[PDB]
Amino acid sequence: MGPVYVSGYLALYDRDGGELALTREIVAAALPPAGPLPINIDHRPRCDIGAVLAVVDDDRGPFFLGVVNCPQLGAVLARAVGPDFFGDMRLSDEERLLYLLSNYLPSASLSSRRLAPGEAPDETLFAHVALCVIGRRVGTIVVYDASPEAAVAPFRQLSARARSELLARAAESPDRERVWHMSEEALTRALLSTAVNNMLLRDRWELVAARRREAGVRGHTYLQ
Amino acid sequence: MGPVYVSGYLALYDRDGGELALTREIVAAALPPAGPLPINIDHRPRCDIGAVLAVVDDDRGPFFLGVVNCPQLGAVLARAVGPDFFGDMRLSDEERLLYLLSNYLPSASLSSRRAPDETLFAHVALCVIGRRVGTIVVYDASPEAAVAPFRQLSARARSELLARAAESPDRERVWHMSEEALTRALLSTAVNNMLLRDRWELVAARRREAGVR
Ligand SMILES: *P(=O)(OC(C)C)OC(C)C
Ligand SMILES: *P(=O)(OC(C)C)OC(C)C
Ligand SMILES: [Cl-]
Ligand SMILES: [Cl-]
Ligand SMILES: [Cl-]
Ligand SMILES: [Mg+2]
Numbered sequence A: 001m002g003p004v005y006v007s008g009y010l011a012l013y014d015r016d017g018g019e020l021a022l023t024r025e026i027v028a029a030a031l032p033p034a035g036p037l038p039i040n041i042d043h044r045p046r047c048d049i050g051a052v053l054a055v056v057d058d059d060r061g062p063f064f065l066g067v068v069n070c071p072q073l074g075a076v077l078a079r080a081v082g083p084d085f086f087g088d089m090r091l092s093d094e095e096r097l098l099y100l101l102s103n104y105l106p107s108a109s110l111s112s113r114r115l116a117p118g119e120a121p122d123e124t125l126f127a128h129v130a131l132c133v134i135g136r137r138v139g140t141i142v143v144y145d146a147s148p149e150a151a152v153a154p155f156r157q158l159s160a161r162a163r164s165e166l167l168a169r170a171a172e173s174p175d176r177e178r179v180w181h182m183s184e185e186a187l188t189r190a191l192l193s194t195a196v197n198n199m200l201l202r203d204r205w206e207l208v209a210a211r212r213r214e215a216g217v218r219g220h221t222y223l224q
Numbered sequence B: 001m002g003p004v005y006v007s008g009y010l011a012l013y014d015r016d017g018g019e020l021a022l023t024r025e026i027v028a029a030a031l032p033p034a035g036p037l038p039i040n041i042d043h044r045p046r047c048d049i050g051a052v053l054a055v056v057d058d059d060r061g062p063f064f065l066g067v068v069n070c071p072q073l074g075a076v077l078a079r080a081v082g083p084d085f086f087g088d089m090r091l092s093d094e095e096r097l098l099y100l101l102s103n104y105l106p107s108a109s110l111s112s113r114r115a116p117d118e119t120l121f122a123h124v125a126l127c128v129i130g131r132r133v134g135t136i137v138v139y140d141a142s143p144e145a146a147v148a149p150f151r152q153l154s155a156r157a158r159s160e161l162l163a164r165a166a167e168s169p170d171r172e173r174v175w176h177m178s179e180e181a182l183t184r185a186l187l188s189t190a191v192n193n194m195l196l197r198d199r200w201e202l203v204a205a206r207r208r209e210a211g212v213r
Helices: A024-030 A071-080 A093-104 A148-152 A160-171 A184-198 A204-215 B024-030 B071-080 B093-104 B143-147 B155-167 B179-193 B199-210
Strands: A004-009 A038-041 A048-058 A061-068 A107-112 A126-132 A143-145 B004-009 B038-041 B048-058 B061-068 B107-112 B121-127 B138-140
Touching: A004 A093, A004 A107, A004 A148, A024 A048, A038 A061, A038 A184, A048 A126, A048 A160, A061 A126, A061 A148, A061 A160, A071 A093, A071 A184, A071 B179, A093 A143, A143 A148, A148 A160, A184 B071, A184 B093, A184 B179, B004 B048, B004 B093, B004 B107, B004 B143, B024 B048, B024 B061, B038 B061, B038 B179, B048 B121, B048 B155, B061 B143, B061 B155, B071 B093, B071 B179, B093 B138, B138 B143, B143 B155
Parallel strands: A038 A126, B038 B121
Antiparallel strands: A004 A061, A004 A143, A038 A048, A048 A061, A107 A126, B004 B061, B004 B138, B038 B048, B048 B061, B107 B121
């Protein structure tokens, strides 16, 4: 086991309706987070598997870089797949993990505190980032990779400024070398929860492709 | 935890290709299965949650009725659903299990061994998509309700099915399983199906094939 990195937009300005929309003003008030934001699975409490290392206010929206480093995750995922799942392919442990995570949890969801009537946004606003199948906000696909620079590279419209600032802030996060241990039983439950809550979702792979387009990540072709 | 009943066609005559196709003669020789047919999740060993109570040779294909009686199954599925999934509904624990099973494991898959006789059929695995045409299942609180939605199931076959199932020795059994093992089996179902495209279209087609409305 070693750590893996995850990144993407947490929202895109002007791209959501109503209650979901995150405005430039809210994001400016919310950053930097008052404490580090954890990364959990499907908003479940007690199943943190990483932490956001940096959030940047890019021109198109707030963009994050996270680390996921739960030793048991690879084990639980590998035990779940049938014996001939990867066929003839030879892959490292790290690459199987990346493949399964990428496809089991291809999106992110930023969760915020519910503010009271007339309570102003501040740095306590953002609570956590949940990995999920489809986020409710436009363009909230994630990329996972074995290093931070590779995790962020696919986002073609991320500005260079914001990219540099992001990578710099992340390189000095307290959470950068942390490890999140969980029992296998707890992790298994957390992953099953994602499946059960998303079982009814229609057209999930077209929705994933749409999120990818919205984010500016080169679309996955399936024509060969 | 009263038991769960499950039913459906194990195959339809004249509808599968080659390796999957079951003929009438072969089916007639295979019934009645000469020992009880376990019900499991995805053909997994050490993962029995039920048994087939009867199979009948309906005009359209072999049709089964089973009982699933595994206390831990209800608990594992119910823990998994997020706190808003049922809206402002209040479901009983049994109605919730029925719903979640219905949608988590909507199909069945009959496995055999390799002259043909009553030992041929081995077990029935619950799954997301069965390889054979029309292998949807219905789950419900009684055998009557479990078989009701199959419009094309013959009255004769339905009556023979319900009567044999009412006499089955397995009808009151219980299958205690560890929550840990169950949670693994269910997670395996999700990971092995995660990449499946248009799953609910394939299920709707299975349903139409079985003659469910
Ligand atoms: P998120 O996108 O939710 C935030 C709007 C709180 O995740 C969904 C899939 C529940
Ligand atoms: P079943 O339909 O397979 C029988 C033909 C053994 O299960 C599939 C999903 C493998
Ligand atoms: Cl009849
Ligand atoms: Cl799909
Ligand atoms: Cl679908
Ligand atoms: Mg009913």
